[PDB]
């Protein structure tokens with residue numbers, strides 16, 4: 046049976062080729078996760094169809110209805126067989142699906158517009174002139190809410206009370222906010238996205254400071270899936286053989302623009 | 304039955320306390336992995352016994368005999384229930400035991416004597432006056448042997464043919480060699496150990512450059528063990544709650560001897 050892969054349209058993980066109207070099926074798309082899906086399938090010996098997650102979401106359980114959205118939802122309700130995407134390995138997700146070991150590492154990080162006199166989280170925490178914030182909901186916002194670290198706690202109390210709101214609706218809005226705010230806004234987002242944008246025109250942003258936490262992206266299959274074991278071994282082999290590092294370099298830097 | 308934990312005496316992971324003689328059982332020991340064991344056990348609801356791996360090894364399969372040694376071996380052959388140690392998640396190990404998601408990230412990194420004019424692997428590869436090497440067997444050596452990366456290929460060829468030998472038998476030997484070599488020896492080792500040593504007296508070494516690869520330490524259980532599921536969930540909760548970062552900072556930096 047053909048394996049149904051769910052993934053998400055987000056550069057540079059999955060894009061539609063410029064000539065996509067000339068192509069069919071899996072060949073319409075390109076990117077990091079497109080290449081990885083190919084390697085995973087080759088190493089596990091399956092045929093697959095790439096599909097884009099219906100609701101454009103990653104995977105969250107609605108606190109009221111208990112329903113899972115996004116790619117995780119597509120796995121647990123049987124719409125797809127495997128998710129290959131920048132999907133963070135988290136406890137609540139691990140409880141309902143299986144994750145491979147991580148294929149990429151990342152953490153919360155600071156994006157500034159080039160020129161901004163900020164080099165770290167401590168720098169942000171001790172001032173208020175350069176506003177800074179996060180997505181208006183999600184794990185990053187929650188990281189700050191629950192932090193007991195002095196710097197991060199100070200950043201959190203600043204963010205919640207700051208006027209006007211320092212929170213944004215989408216990461217795209219956050220990046221745009223940095224870019225148009227004339228050095229007066231910094232945005233807190235995944236290091237992977239931060240590092241990618243730094244290599245996109247007009248090359249006006251920069252990742253600064255170390256990551257504030259650590260996590261990884263993992264390939265997700267449903268509990269008891271016949272694919273889980275082989276997929277996991279595949280990730281480790283690709284890492285050990287240098288392929289994941291080669292793939293990140295390809296999509297972030299060789300194809301960079303700055 | 305009380306869970307049998309196997310681990311290895313390696314600082315700052317597991318250390319005998321200075322007054323260990325006045326103590327008994329698990330209380331004899333301290334370190335990152337001792338703290339981690341307590342938190343894993345707490346969240347999973349089991350009591351445990353910390354035991355030290357009999358043969359002093361991590362886990363490799365002999366090519367000829369095909370026996371697994373070290374902590375992996377103790378799990379594979381049923382001598383221990385769980386391994387909690389700086390044990391790298393690797394493909395060959397993953398095939399014979401179960402691993403939690405990683406509790407610590409790391410990679411191959413360069414240690415220099417403070418003052419050595421070297422910032423990267425590429426720097427090392429382009430010259431010979433500063434000799435450089437690694438453990439004389441194991442994954443870091445094999446990483447270089449098999450690499451297709453031009454720079455690492457060049458370093459492997461250099462290392463294999465360099466005289467006198469640039470390899471060392473142990474980590475301690477490697478560190479001692481860097482420190483006593485007046486800047487003419489650099490040592491390739493795990494970033495985690497590199498970072499630790501930089502915070503130890505006499506504060507005469509430093510980590511330089513990015514890591515050359517990426518991997519993680521994982522909590523290991525025998526394949527199919529009922530402990531695997533809860534232990535993995537525990538690791539994830541501890542990471543997301545900030546505890547793993549807290550333990551790292553505690554043992555590497557709060558207890559560091561070279562200051563901020």
Ligand SMILES: O=C(O)c1cc(O)cc([C@H]2CCN[C@@H]2C(=O)O)c1
Nearest residue numbers: 103131132133180182183184185186
């Ligand atoms: O850091 C956040 O606050 C955040 C909020 C979201 O709504 C989505 C994400 C995505 C981006 C890709 N990986 C995350 C994931 O897999 O869930 C991150």
Ligand SMILES: O=C(O)c1cc(O)cc([C@H]2CCN[C@@H]2C(=O)O)c1
Nearest residue numbers: 361389390391438440441442443444
């Ligand atoms: O970097 C090496 O080449 C290397 C060689 C070894 O013989 C042992 C180790 C240990 C140290 C802790 N983690 C590794 C592990 O889990 O195997 C590392």
